[PDB]
Design a protein around this ligand. Structure first.
Ligand SMILES: [Cl-]
Ligand SMILES: [Cl-]
Ligand SMILES: [Cl-]
Ligand SMILES: [Cl-]
Ligand SMILES: [Cl-]
Ligand SMILES: [K+]
Ligand SMILES: [Mg+2]
Ligand SMILES: [Mg+2]
Ligand SMILES: [Mg+2]
Ligand SMILES: [Mg+2]
Ligand SMILES: [Mg+2]
Ligand SMILES: [Mg+2]
Ligand SMILES: [Mg+2]
Ligand SMILES: [Mg+2]
Ligand SMILES: [Mg+2]
Ligand SMILES: [Mg+2]
Ligand SMILES: [Mg+2]
Ligand SMILES: [Mg+2]
Ligand SMILES: [Mg+2]
Ligand SMILES: [Mg+2]
Ligand SMILES: [Mg+2]
Ligand code: NA
Ligand code: NA
Ligand code: NA
Ligand code: NA
Ligand code: NA
Ligand code: NA
Ligand code: NA
Ligand code: NA
Ligand code: NA
Ligand code: NA
Ligand code: NA
Ligand code: NA
Ligand code: NA
Ligand code: NA
Ligand code: NA
Ligand code: NA
Ligand code: NA
Lengths: 165, 95, 55, 174
RNA sequence: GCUGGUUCCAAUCGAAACAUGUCGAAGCAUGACCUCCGCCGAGGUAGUCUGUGAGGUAGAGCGACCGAUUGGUGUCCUCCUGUCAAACUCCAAACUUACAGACGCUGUUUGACGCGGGGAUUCCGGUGCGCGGGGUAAGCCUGUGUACCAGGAGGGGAACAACCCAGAGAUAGGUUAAGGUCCCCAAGUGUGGAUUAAGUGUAAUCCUCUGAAGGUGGUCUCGAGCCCUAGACAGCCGGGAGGUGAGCUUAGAAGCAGCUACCCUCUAAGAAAAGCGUAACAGCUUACCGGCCGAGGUUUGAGGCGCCCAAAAUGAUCGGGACUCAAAUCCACCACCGAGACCUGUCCGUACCACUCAUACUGGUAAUCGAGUAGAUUGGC
RNA sequence: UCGACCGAGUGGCUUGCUACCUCGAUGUCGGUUCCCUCCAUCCUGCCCGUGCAGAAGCGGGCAAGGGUGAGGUUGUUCGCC
């Protein structure tokens, strides 16, 4: 468990090219598509997204903890077969290095992992739900934003007028 | 640079747009210039011969004479006068 | 004397409009109370605050 | 804002500086009411609480002053009264008034008496296992009542098992 | 080729801490760059504009290549759906750059641009800002463009190489700059508003001034929806009835173990019961209705300032005192103080001009002359 | 009461990194003796919760006034007993 303080900034050039980079660890992200995959997003009255408020790198282990803790809540509330879908839109393309094992001699790091670069204002997660379940997705997102670096905004992108009043 | 050859860092400047690829039209290869004429130096990626050192792409020189079919063009590199041997295919008349 | 001032200032999403009353003894001074007040209460520059009508 | 409190019948209210005094057949209560830019005055038969300030902190104190004065009206006429009941399981608890303090002997078998000193003009009257605590000032009476209950507090043992103590039973209204 | 030292005054110019080679990296040579001398004789180009050219970084995009990278279907199968690139590009700046013209500035007695020759010094650099590459990071390593320190005074900044003003002959009178105007301390306890109660704060930049994720009916301001004098919201009082203890299950399942149903009357209203509660009934509430009262209520979006989160070693701090409708913060505004800057009198040096054998005198010009380590040049004690 | 994953921090006691200070020298480790301090508190005081009957505990809050000792192995610090 290396701290994200090491990896969270965009200070480095984009390092994505697998033709030049070997030994890249697999992603810990289980699924990018959750709930009912056979159903269209547009079948739902309500669309809610988690928006990242600062440009950052979110590493794959953090994406998974975040996704997990959100989807686990939906499953616990709406039920395993519950009617909704959640998308994790970002993929961890940026490869991460650590200079481990000499000091600063030949310091270029070995490959330790992956992160997703997210610009401020982007949708990280988008969930589609029925009006009755909307407070359950808000709650899932609250748990999710606690597991990633940046402060987040929770936004209802469709059917807000239907919500509460 | 990791190497000092003349083609170092020439990837862009020596490459055609894919539409301009293929044998270039002969009209500009046979163009005739007079002593005193200002010409622009730009290598044509599709024409292998009569070239000059890629560092001089973009120079505008003055035609001072011919050597065989090639032209002798006078430029100033930094503060230094040089004479470039180049064919019409890589030359365009200024204005 | 009570003057009512209406206008708008930049916001998240669309621009936001207000209506505000002040005790100033003039139509000019009433305008500059709104400028002064919103400068304080909203941390807003005077150029950002756009005033349409004073009544 | 401004609020007006009609003084009730057979009650007098005097205001000297930040102090207000209320006199009735049951007694007299004086109170300091002091908060920035709140004026408390007696005008004729009506007590007036007012301020040029409308902010939440000001309204809070205004509402508080109102209830303080009304409580004083109630205390000098009708009076204030708290009911209390002594309970014990094993050791009989002796609860008496000695001078200006109420004294509790044999609490949980303790050799040492527990004491609390009565606030102000408050009266403590014991009849068997019942007590009544009364007076004109709700502050003094309420506290005297509370002190009696607090005096039987036990930190070190399970309270669900050890319940002995004097407890407030009836609490005043209006 | 390493450390130390190398003794009088003044005037002009004024660096390099980089490139190539080197048993070379604590050195040297050759270039770059500084300076002096002779020659040449009319152009030159540190700025901008325009024209004729060069370019593939930022951004963007990828059914435009390429390689990464989602899911769902229709029989490996031409739609839909989710993402990317320093070593990808169907696109594509700002910008940098070759040449020419124009304006500007400069040069033709101060000879520019250039040519030839003499003399060096220098090849440990550093910092800020912008762009970077490496690194968890560094008062870190290594580039790049630029300005500064080095070699740069004076005025601010508590102190303080490179942050702000500012480039400076002597002397003198003014007026400003940065930054300040409650006292220490020159100038305001200035004006019109508003916020903050935390001494928050009184801290531009920074190794240096911390404070984060996450919280906040602390408080101020600006919206949107719904309800309300046909009486809302809250509280208090009263009423929450009958079929009926619904059916099934069960020994009994009585609103409330469980399955299913969830009808019907009397009504102003009251569930085949929303939650406690019982072994099961009691019993307490909620829904729902009426009364008392009387004026706003309620949901939700955004913003400002503060609060929590917040633990270190000799004596606590914003430089200090201390400050709370400020001496804090934000929006404006008014008058001041305050440099060697700028203006101005006189003088000095230097360059140049006129006169001359000679600035030896005399007169004139400098907005476009006056800081300087190493070093080059020259008058003098 | 224990508490994973992931996320945000504080300290400057370890270790590593850097090469800014000193090579015309700032005397080493461990121990000792003597003084002052910090709090992230082991005991003591006052509290809160408890899977608190009591007793004995466990966990937490405030709190640095005082205390925190003697021995066997090992140069040891540390650590074991
Ligand atoms: Cl060539
Ligand atoms: Cl200068
Ligand atoms: Cl203070
Ligand atoms: Cl002399
Ligand atoms: Cl010893
Ligand atoms: K040393
Ligand atoms: Mg006990
Ligand atoms: Mg000298
Ligand atoms: Mg001289
Ligand atoms: Mg040389
Ligand atoms: Mg390129
Ligand atoms: Mg890019
Ligand atoms: Mg470039
Ligand atoms: Mg030096
Ligand atoms: Mg003074
Ligand atoms: Mg402070
Ligand atoms: Mg800062
Ligand atoms: Mg000089
Ligand atoms: Mg010593
Ligand atoms: Mg503590
Ligand atoms: Mg002590
Ligand atoms: Na090595
Ligand atoms: Na977060
Ligand atoms: Na071609
Ligand atoms: Na060097
Ligand atoms: Na060398
Ligand atoms: Na050497
Ligand atoms: Na010109
Ligand atoms: Na950029
Ligand atoms: Na300088
Ligand atoms: Na100073
Ligand atoms: Na303070
Ligand atoms: Na010198
Ligand atoms: Na260290
Ligand atoms: Na020394
Ligand atoms: Na020692
Ligand atoms: Na202590
Ligand atoms: Na021992």
């Amino acid at each position: 468990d290396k701290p994200a303080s090491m990896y969270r900034d965009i200070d480095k050039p984009a390092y994505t090219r697998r033709e030049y980079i070997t030994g890249i660890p697999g992603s810990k992200i289980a699924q990018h598509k959750m709930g009912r995959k056979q159903k269209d997003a547009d079948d739902y009255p309500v669309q809610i997204s988690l928006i990242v408020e600062e440009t950052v790198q979110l590493r794959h282990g953090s994406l998974e903890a975040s996704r997990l803790s959100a989807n686990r809540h939906l499953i616990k509330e709406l039920g395993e077969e519950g009617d909704y879908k959640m998308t994790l839109r970002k993929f961890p393309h940026q490869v991460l290095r650590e200079n481990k094992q000499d000091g600063m001699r030949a310091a270029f790091g070995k490959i330790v992992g992956t992160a997703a670069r997210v610009q401020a204002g982007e949708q990280l997660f988008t969930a589609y739900c029925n009006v009755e379940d909307a407070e359950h997705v808000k709650e899932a997102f609250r748990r999710a934003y606690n597991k990633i670096t940046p402060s987040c905004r929770i936004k209802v992108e469709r059917g807000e007028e239907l919500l509460i009043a | 640079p990791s190497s000092n050859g003349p083609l170092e860092g020439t990837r862009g400047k020596l490459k055609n747009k894919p539409r301009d690829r293929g044998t270039s039209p002969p009209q500009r290869a046979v163009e005739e210039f007079d002593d005193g004429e200002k010409v622009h130096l730009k290598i044509d990626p599709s024409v292998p011969n009569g070239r000059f050192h890629p560092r001089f792409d973009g120079q505008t020189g003055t035609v001072e004479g011919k050597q065989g079919d090639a032209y002798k063009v006078d430029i100033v590199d930094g503060g230094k006068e040089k004479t470039i041997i180049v064919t019409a295919a890589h030359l365009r008349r200024q204005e | 004397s009570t003057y009512t001032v209406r206008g708008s200032f930049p916001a998240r999403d669309g621009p936001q409009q207000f209506e505000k009353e002040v005790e100033a003894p003039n139509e000019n001074v009433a305008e500059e109370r709104v400028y002064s007040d919103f400068g304080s209460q909203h941390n807003l520059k005077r150029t950002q605050i756009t005033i349409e009508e004073v009544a | 804002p401004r609020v007006e409190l009609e003084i009730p019948e057979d009650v007098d209210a005097e205001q000297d500086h930040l102090d207000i005094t209320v006199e009735g057949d049951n007694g007299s209560v004086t109170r300091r009411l002091w908060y920035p830019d709140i004026d408390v005055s007696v005008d004729g038969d009506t007590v007036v609480i007012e301020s040029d300030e409308d902010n939440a902190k000001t309204m809070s104190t205004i509402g508080t002053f109102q209830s303080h004065i009304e409580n004083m009206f109630h205390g000098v006429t009708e009076g204030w009264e708290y009911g209390m009941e002594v309970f014990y399981s094993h050791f009989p608890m002796q609860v008496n008034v000695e001078g200006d303090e109420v004294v509790i002997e044999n609490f949980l078998g303790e050799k040492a008496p527990r004491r609390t000193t009565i606030h102000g003009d408050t009266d403590v009257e014991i009849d068997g296992e019942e007590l009544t605590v009364s007076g004109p000032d709700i502050e003094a009476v309420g506290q005297t009542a509370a002190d009696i209950e607090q005096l039987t507090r036990i930190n070190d043992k399970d309270v669900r098992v050890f319940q002995d103590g004097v407890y407030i039973t009836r609490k005043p209204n209006r």
